[PDB]
User: What shape does this take?
Amino acid sequence: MEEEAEMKAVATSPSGRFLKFDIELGRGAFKTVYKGLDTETWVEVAWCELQDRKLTKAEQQRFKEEAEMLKGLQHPNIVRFYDSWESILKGKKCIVLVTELMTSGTLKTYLKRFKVMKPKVLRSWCRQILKGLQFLHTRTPPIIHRDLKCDNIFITGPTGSVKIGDLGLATLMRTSFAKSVIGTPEFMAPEMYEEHYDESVDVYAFGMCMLEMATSEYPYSECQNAAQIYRKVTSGIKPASFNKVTDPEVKEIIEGCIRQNKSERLSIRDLLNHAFFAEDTGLRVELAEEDDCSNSSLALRLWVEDPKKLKGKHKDNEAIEFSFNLETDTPEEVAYEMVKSGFFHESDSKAVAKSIRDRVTPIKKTRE
Assistant: This one.
């Protein structure tokens, strides 16, 4: 039984397609989001009201057209923008943005409580933010998100896909004041407060999102306030949580993204070509426990990411926990022990041994 019958429509788009309900979903300076309805599809939408009062006639016409540019953005990793128009709020001009309503919330809400699910969702959500950003940066003229952070990444579900939303509008962030209210220091590149920055601010913010997804903790939480973060960021002092990244590949991508010098930062084109984003083997090995160099034995986990890529009747999300002595063991012999125990068919030995070798050869080198 639905009580959608009691929700009274309080406004309509000039087109007539969308209805506004007086149910506020979120706030912020310059923005109020409302529950809305599409009368063509009968699906609840977000009715967003955007307004900067202290805006000139010239600035307002540039903000209205920036809003109209978003309508033509269609990509599976970008929240869909259905329509935008100019209206009046408290006598002054305002912009209304109608967008898809994300019911499973943000990545920020998700990471407050939950770790990203295993075996593949971390790699997928990363690749999806990169694909979404790449799409925005390849528009004519290029779009820069300007406000990328976990609270602006929406999830379809814990095993679903991610969508970037709440783009930072160029005209709405022209000033140091607007940037200080809109932006989240943790996710902001050091050059964010300069009058001129490019798309590499979005790369820096991506690096911080990925850090948060990897460490399951908030970047720069050691800081008491935003001034301390600004001081640390501009000094070239990484978040303490960066040294909590246990995967060398994940630590490498992050550092290449959160580089102080904008020109030294990694490009999305090349990131998308990183081996970390490959899924050809269908097998991956990770550390199960925190590695103490006093120990000779590691505690590892083998993930069957793709049961189709293997001979036999394998279940989804299959994870094998096994020990490995860095001194006396070999990946090829351990893969044979997996075959013998009945985990794998003999013909998958080479694929198993490689997944083990990939994780175990770097750690063995580090040992003294």
User: Anything to note?
Assistant: The chain has three domains: 1-101, 102-278, 279-368. Residues 279-368 form a domain with the Ubiquitin-like (UB roll) fold (CATH 3.10.20.90). The chain has ten helices and eleven strands.
